[PDB]
Symmetry: D2
Subunit: 237 residues, 4 copies
């Protein structure tokens, strides 16, 4: 199976796989059963922003999510990612629906990774920023039901012509270039990610969520990972 590290914005409480009884933000290290969660006062139909940060000195994966006019929610987990992930990874966004549903619309996504060596000329970096997405967005790898270009956005899960979200949908978008997150000469390695999202549902119970993830470069949507599995995991182990 793939190797997954993710920050989930989990909109539906699945209590038999350890979700708390409310929407939540969570840190997922090789399992859908988050290592750490925090309550998330999700707002149906409002644009939110999530921020993800990490560095190899402190070895703490942290995330913050907010809406305008609202307080934030935050979660952190102590983890040495160099012991979890390979040296080269891809980074992405994933989302799913099940029998319950929502739009999983991404309006912007940015990422920066840096590796500072002990050489004289120390810095190495990758950065991207998307504030719009074209029909043919060649620097994204789209998987499953993900599409780009409708209203200039990334729709991770299927939305009908009406604009209504569909159930039983799973889709991801990965940045095309592999990312180097460890190197033998690096003295500090760091990354940051931000994305803005619009989760809308006609229903009092939206599902299933959006995640930012980091994986093996060849990651693909696991069989049967609609719904609670967020397009990330093959099972709920």
């Amino acid at each position: 199976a793939d190797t997954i590290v993710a920050v989930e914005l989990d909109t539906y409480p699945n209590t038999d796989i350890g979700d708390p009884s409310y929407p939540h933000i969570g840190i997922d290290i090789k399992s859908v059963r988050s290592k750490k969660t925090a309550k998330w006062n999700m707002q149906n139909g409002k644009v939110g922003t999530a921020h993800i940060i990490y560095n190899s000195v402190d070895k703490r994966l942290s995330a913050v999510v907010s809406y305008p006019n609202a307080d934030s929610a935050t979660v952190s987990y102590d983890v040495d990612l160099d012991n979890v992930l390979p040296e080269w990874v891809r980074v992405g966004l994933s989302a799913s629906t099940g029998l319950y549903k929502e739009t999983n619309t991404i309006l912007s996504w940015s990422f920066t990774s840096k590796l500072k060596s002990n050489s004289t000329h120390e810095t190495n970096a990758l950065h991207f920023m998307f504030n719009q997405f074209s029909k043919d967005q060649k620097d994204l790898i789209l998987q499953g039901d993900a599409t780009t270009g409708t209203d200039g956005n990334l729709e991770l899960t299927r939305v009908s012509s009406n604009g209504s979200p569909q159930g039983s949908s799973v889709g991801r978008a990965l940045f095309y270039a592999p990312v180097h997150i460890w190197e033998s000469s690096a003295v500090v390695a760091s990354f940051e990610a931000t994305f803005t999202f619009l989760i809308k549902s006609p229903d009092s119970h939206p599902a299933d969520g959006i995640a930012f993830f980091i994986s093996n470069i060849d990651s693909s949507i696991p069989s049967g990972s609609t719904g609670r599995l967020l397009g990330l995991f093959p099972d709920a182990n």
Copy 2:
């Protein structure tokens, strides 16, 4: 054939294809026969730096090259790249040798592209920076004789175990992700590139040079493009 835009650091004067009678910097638009050149006082065995800049408002491709303790050389050419190149491109470095030879060593390479739309949330960007190159540099596409990791550098052309440059060599490195240089909503599009290089030769007449280039995403080394053709063109037309 591929579509090529390049800035050449041409170390060998080939007077029958329009080179001036000295090493020179040049702007190449779909031909090895530069549209504009300037004299370049190349220094064998010293580390130099080249800078390349462009934006879609002014439609002027400009380059500057220097060494420490030396004056610079610069060239500019008025060209609307949106009329020359496709919407999506790859960017790279190329170099060659022929019967005359040199090392074509790259010590660092950075690039930034930006597209600013008329939306509210206007900016889109790609940036990379390499200050070292690993044996397995997964975010570069290496072509021909190019290798990475010897002394942490990118060697575009073949160097023997002795450290001696070989003749009759051609190699390129392209950044893995495609780059979006035009978009229908962009109000300003720009790019900048910098690279540092070490061209060394045991000979009074080094050849053939290094170029930064922008091409169709599927570009590949043309047959027979050793020597004067810089790994860029199939002929001297």
Copy 3:
């Protein structure tokens, strides 16, 4: 008198000082009588964005302005700023009203300056970005009627408690640090600026406009520079 270079978004046509007979964008080199203008289809009450770019290789000051859902307007002028401005400058935003009036609200302002030398370790930079402004914004120098913090914005000219713009008002904001735009070792010097603005008026004829400017470090609002003089010039010479 101060030395001023500016890009004006001139909302009121003053035909006796050379304005065209419509709102316009203009490049001002030491005079309110723009060296170059272009028609600007200003939209009362909509948020717009302006972009300003320059580099010392090409010696062309260019600007673009747009609104969402609208085409852009652009202007360019060939000028060697090293012959106009001192080595160290301050950068700012200015606006005015007269007998005619408008709000001159700034919602964001960013700037980047870079100087690349011929040394090994070549780059020098300053960047700032404001997406909000506090009541006590210590890294801005406010002049005249400019205030910060109302609805988190920079109001360059006076607005009453009602939210109604006042006439006969002039205000500027300068970034606190001086900016180094020429240096003897620089091989390329560049800058870019962006700002977003909301110009609203209850009147069919708003006035007078907003400008981004670059000046001597000790610049101050000239006496009598309300109205057509944009807080920038002492007279219409």
Copy 4:
């Protein structure tokens, strides 16, 4: 007295104020008596690089120092800087000598601060980068014996015409603009700093060190802060 947070590169062991018995890197929170140290294998006459990082989610101040061809040293301390420092600060470099001495030469200094709010348009930033220093470096506030421009470097402490370091010297350089490190709407605040330094001494026992610091905006060199006090503290409390 001023309020100081600093990362020290302490070259001389003063065992009665808690220094370990070797050169060390340390985190100083309102006292010269570091809260945390780590052994630092300082190399007389070689160029080193220090990196400092912090964010308000994790509340951990961390630093790494290295030389080419050498292993790094690192230190971290859990501290909420919003409880230590004011909302607006200045950032700087300081160094000292005493009866023992060294050069305290800075070859480059960069800094980035970011404040991400919960608004739509979330990011606010300041960045600077110096890779050279001019005789008249207007965006630095020089204190005590600090000078700029000799060999294009920042000499924090006095060096004679011979190039020999002097004893009993203290000097600092602060960036001119104040820096906003907390804001009521910020959901994440972060900073990073890097500097490269050359500490040389004709003596087997160099002293006293270099620090990166963050202070109240009006900070000044305390009386009698030569030597062990690093230009930072008025006493060894």
